[PDB]
């Protein structure tokens, strides 16, 4: 289908940007509050994307 | 062979198993940057 493609690409670009965001945020102690906050939000997006992309695999 | 909608990423999956080896290399450049404890 069409939405499967766009979300599967979305997973790749999201996982890419999270994987360079995590250690940089952790290394540095400045303004770590808001850092933990958007890690929480991005990890939440990510564990949502994974099961939606999972189930739409079966409508391929 | 891979799924037929997953064939765009067919070249991508082929450098995945190598990734652990590169960690050993990463763990060395980190020591090069710090100028060697």
């Amino acid at each position: 289908t069409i939405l499967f493609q766009l979300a599967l690409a979305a997973l790749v670009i999201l996982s890419f940007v999270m994987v360079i965001g995590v250690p940089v945020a952790y290394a540095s102690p400045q303004d770590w509050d808001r850092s933990k906050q958007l890690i929480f939000l991005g990890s939440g997006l990510w564990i949502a994307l994974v099961l939606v992309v999972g189930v739409l695999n079966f409508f391929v | 062979k891979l799924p037929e909608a997953y064939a765009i990423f067919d070249p991508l999956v082929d450098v995945l198993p190598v990734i652990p080896v590169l960690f050993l290399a990463l763990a060395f450049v980190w020591q090069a940057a710090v100028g060697f404890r």
Binding site: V12, F16, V19, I20, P23, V24, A27, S28, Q30 | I8, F9, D10, P11, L12, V15, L22, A25, L26, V29, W30, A33, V34
Partner: peptide, 28 residues
Amino acid sequence: IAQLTMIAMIGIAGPMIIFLLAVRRGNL
């Protein structure tokens, strides 16, 4: 298609995540 761009950027991602700790003061 863009399936060299991915294999390019993942291999150059190595030194980048060191280099950002150098400015934001995680370690020199």
